[PDB]
Amino acid sequence: ASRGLAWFQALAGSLAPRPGDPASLRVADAELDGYPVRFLAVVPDPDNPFPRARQGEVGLLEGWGLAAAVDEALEADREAPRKRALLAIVDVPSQAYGRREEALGIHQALAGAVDAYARARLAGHPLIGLLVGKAMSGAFLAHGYQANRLIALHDPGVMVHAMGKAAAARITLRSVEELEALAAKVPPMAYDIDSYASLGLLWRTLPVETVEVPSTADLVRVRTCLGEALADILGGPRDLGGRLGAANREASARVRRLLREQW
Amino acid sequence: PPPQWSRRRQEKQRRLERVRGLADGAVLPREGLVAALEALIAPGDRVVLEGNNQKQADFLSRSLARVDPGKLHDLHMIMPSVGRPEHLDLFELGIARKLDFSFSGPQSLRIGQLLEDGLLEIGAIHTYIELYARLVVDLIPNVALVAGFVADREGNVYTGPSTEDTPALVEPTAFSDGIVIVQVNRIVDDPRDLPRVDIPASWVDFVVEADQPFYIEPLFTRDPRHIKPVHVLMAMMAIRGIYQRHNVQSLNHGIGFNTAAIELILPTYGESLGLKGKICRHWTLNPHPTLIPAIESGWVESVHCFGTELGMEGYIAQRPDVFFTGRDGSLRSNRMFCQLAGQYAVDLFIGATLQVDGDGHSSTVTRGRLAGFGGAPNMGHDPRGRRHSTPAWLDMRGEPEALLERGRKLVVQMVETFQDGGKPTFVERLDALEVARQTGMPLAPVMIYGDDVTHVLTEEGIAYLYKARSLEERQAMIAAVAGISPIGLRHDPRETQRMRREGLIALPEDLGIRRTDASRELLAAKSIAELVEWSGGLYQPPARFRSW
Amino acid sequence: METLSFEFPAGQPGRGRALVGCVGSGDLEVLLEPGQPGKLSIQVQTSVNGSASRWQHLFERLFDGQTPPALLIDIHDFGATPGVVRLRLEQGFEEIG
Amino acid sequence: DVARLLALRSFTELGARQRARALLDAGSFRELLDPFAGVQSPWLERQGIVPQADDGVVVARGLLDGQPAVLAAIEGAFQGGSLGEVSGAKIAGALELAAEDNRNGVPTRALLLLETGGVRLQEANLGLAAIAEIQAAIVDLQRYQPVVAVIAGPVGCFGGMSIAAGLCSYVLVTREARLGLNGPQVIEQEAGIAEYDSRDRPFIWSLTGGEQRFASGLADAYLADDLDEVRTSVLAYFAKGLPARPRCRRAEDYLRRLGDLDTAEQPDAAGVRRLY
Ligand SMILES: CC(C)(COP(=O)(O)OP(=O)(O)OC[C@H]1O[C@@H](n2cnc3c(N)ncnc32)[C@H](O)[C@@H]1OP(=O)(O)O)[C@@H](O)C(=O)NCCC(=O)NCCS
Ligand SMILES: [Cl-]
């Protein structure tokens, strides 16, 4: 039904949704080289109470639902010897776009998600974001961008951005033609994963044999990668400082530096 | 002037009559020299022998080796530099037994060996100005064996561009009833043919027309051909990460290709930052040929010199506004006076080195090789006696309106993570420690102490140690720029961003320096020949560096 | 002299070729060609013996948190310092883009 | 009366730098990375867009009742208050440094004046990365001090920063301010003119207005647009400290209430106040 769903069942075994989670969520605990791992993924739910959230969007339920599952695991390992890692399989086309959604405070729903993941990361839980499909705007802020490390599959279906070129062109006052034009000259404007990589926001990109449904070869390279990523995280700084190494984020780093000088 | 209170005067007097026949006046016969040396020197005398960084009293130095080891034994050699072979020959022949030196040239594997055989005994490794200072306290000298260019029959010596350590080696000897012998290239019968008097005749006891001009070493001259792009990468970080970030107005450059790199990319990389005249206006430096384009580009206002680099004399006479020249037109170097300035009057020192441990301790002393310290310890330390404020000096203060917190001299240690021979520079223990145990050295021979270093500069980046709150934090900073050396392998990379942001370290990226931008194309002069034509034919490189 | 072989997880094959440096004492030569996707295969011939562990660290650091293009890198080293080496690898990698 | 009308002292009538100086204690204002630093957007000139010297954000130190504080005000006039690479890093990096002040004994407060259109689509991925770091630093900081978000309008607060608004301990709003995830046009665009009307201004405020958001608990204070009254409420909320249990950790209550609602039909302004 979506690359997220395909990749969740392939990495977690459990493909049916837990009871208690919205049908749009997919949670499942498991192990990854003897390390406790909870897999989270947002997938489509063509029978979602909200119509504007039936193609995998991260809407009201998906938002709070994520805040639920993470806070669940947060208090479990409140005591545990080893805080369990959270692996976010990211593949969400967008935020839910709709009246129902805005009226009920969808911005607040996704804030519950961000708060959860963030508090988890801060506590010692290792987050890892696996970009297997689309990762857009608010949806990705909620489900993914609190990660200690980001991993994307190298593939044309994997895209990162904040708005569809239709809407972006409108707000901005440009044609879809000049965006795609500009998107080659301005890496932060581009949708492809190569341009994202140049922002040095990815800890690793890894190409695959069959992105739609991982092959036993793929799933082992991906599983190995997560293992390596998880070890890099453990025992180290928990902040997002690792996302400042790239030359295209030169300025982000310079601002933080100047800030401290004048602080 | 009573007997019991003038015993070293009557001893000098006894010595001058055992050559009264052999010498007429102050002039000594070139082919009866070794005879005189056996008469003027006594066994056990403290002898100062000119082995300067450049000027060598090679004739005296050789004649003293062909002395009879039965008439002269247990001599105490005091030499600022031990470069020449005749020098360490004095010890194997049994003429000399103790040595007090500062700079050990190539002779480093030898001195170590001769010491281990019980033929040579070392007092300590000094730093020039320290060793001079001793000559009027601990080590008052008996004989001085120095060198100049011209001398009249009266005793006046013209040391010229090569004055160097002479005025400091001679004075404590002449005025303590000791004996001063100066070899010259030429005696003039008419004294008005002496372009200048550098040493008055009343300090000199005898002059000798040498068998050939005194040997001059181009100790500091560096062939810009050998400057690799890694050197040019550190040179850029020095100029933007240090000279510019602290507004260094005056400085000294330690010997080495590393600082030659800096000198040569000032009129290009320095220019591209519009820094001409904004930094490095005043120098306490040898007249480095690699500095020539920086002079011509109009960066350098003043230069006071320790000595002279062979071949630079003519260039310098043509630049009286920059260098310190006599009324005769030629340079007047003064290693004592320059060294003093390099400590008290200059904003920064920057130099290379052979080893550093995790604490920042630096040294040139390595397994069985007793290298010297040269001028590094004098300029590689925060001069605690200084009070005069200067822009850069003050920038080092943590809390700038604490009136009791004093400033610090910028002390930069500029080195690649690896010595070329696949040895790492930053090691767990200094070799110097083990060399100390096996020499009865009371404390390990460290050239520059870790607590004295303010900047550690590497092809990896800059560590601003002057900001270290604790020793543990200092060690953290060193390892961050230490590469894949055993010290640098202590560093955990996830910690780098923190250290960068906090401004503890600076990567070349942090300075606006793309690493791959480092090429020889930044070198103002690409060869010795190109150095000659910035100088417009005036620089006459010594045969060693000529390709024509 | 000894011959060392390495391998690293990488991305899509790089776009062109590149040559940097020369096998003179103290310098090294680096050949960069596009390679098999997912793999970066390095081959090192060095004049320095038992440096293998040293080359390992150099490379791990170079590729830490930055996935390289899938290339075949042939290095010929005549005793260049890890500093010089690192520099030429970056020259080489810059030219490949 | 008329003297009162002639003496109004509107808050929204001030620009970012004016608001900042106006709230921070008299005389403590000290701007960091000011327009003379010339730390501007590296991505705009190449696209033929004129850049602003401070990239549309005013970040300044100072006091809030003699308590050390940092303030980030977004300027709505510039690119609608859109955050870009430099814009974002001014805010995130400031919250990050406030947090490190709490860990070193200094009880620094973070006051955010949000007048933003979310990610600057002309810097899309670099501004969105920034907001994630803004969010992360907001959470990290609210383990020590509350973050007060002030949304006064005119632009309001949309996109990624509406999610950052959510994360905040207290959210003070005026009547003119809106707080939504997606801007009215964007929804109309993606979902159809029937699902949401970008031209229907009274409708847009009826669901996402400052009044509506306060009457439904998605906001903590419903301020009038007066300079003094806003400062007063700001100072007051910082003084209450961290909230017992903030909207973010109420994940199951809302999930419960949403479960109750009959989603089969379009909720209205009032329908939403009832469901909470
Ligand atoms: C913010 C918003 C609701 C305000 O609209 P409004 O009150 O009618 O005011 P306007 O539409 O006149 O906006 C004025 C300016 O803001 C700019 N702007 C708003 N959001 C922007 C964005 N995300 N990126 C770039 N520019 C933006 C507009 O381009 C416009 O440009 P102009 O000053 O040159 O005329 C509206 O601009 C909007 O819908 N923004 C989209 C926010 C969003 O959904 N974010 C997605 C990214 S995470
Ligand atoms: Cl010197």
Residue numbers in the entry:
A (entry chain E): 6 to 268
B (entry chain A): 7 to 554
C (entry chain C): 1 to 97
D (entry chain D): 3 to 278
Task: Please give the exact wording used by the authors of the publication that reports this structure.
By soaking crystals of the hetero-tetramer with malonyl-CoA, we obtained the structure of MDC in complex with CoA at 3.0 Å resolution (the malonate group was likely hydrolyzed during the soaking). The two hetero-tetramers in the asymmetric unit of this crystal have essentially the same conformation, with rms distance of 0.1 Å for their equivalent Cα atoms. The overall structure of this hetero-tetramer is similar to that of the malonate complex, with rms distance of ~ 0.4 Å for their equivalent Cα atoms. The electron density in the active site of MdcA is smaller than malonate in this structure, and a chloride ion is modeled in one of the active sites. We observed clear electron density for CoA, and it primarily interacts with MdcD, with its thiol group located at the center of the interface and having interactions with the main-chain amides of Val121 and Gly162 of MdcD. These two amides form the oxyanion hole for this active site, stabilizing the transition state of the decarboxylation reaction. The pyrophosphate group of CoA is located near Arg180 of MdcD, while the 3′ phosphate group of CoA is exposed to the solvent. There are substantial conformational changes for the α6–α6A segment of MdcE in the CoA complex compared to the malonate complex or the structure of MdcD–MdcE alone. In the CoA complex, helix α6 is positioned close to the adenine base of CoA. Conformational differences are also observed for the loop containing residues Val121 and Leu123, which allow these two residues to hydrogen bond and recognize the adenine base of CoA.
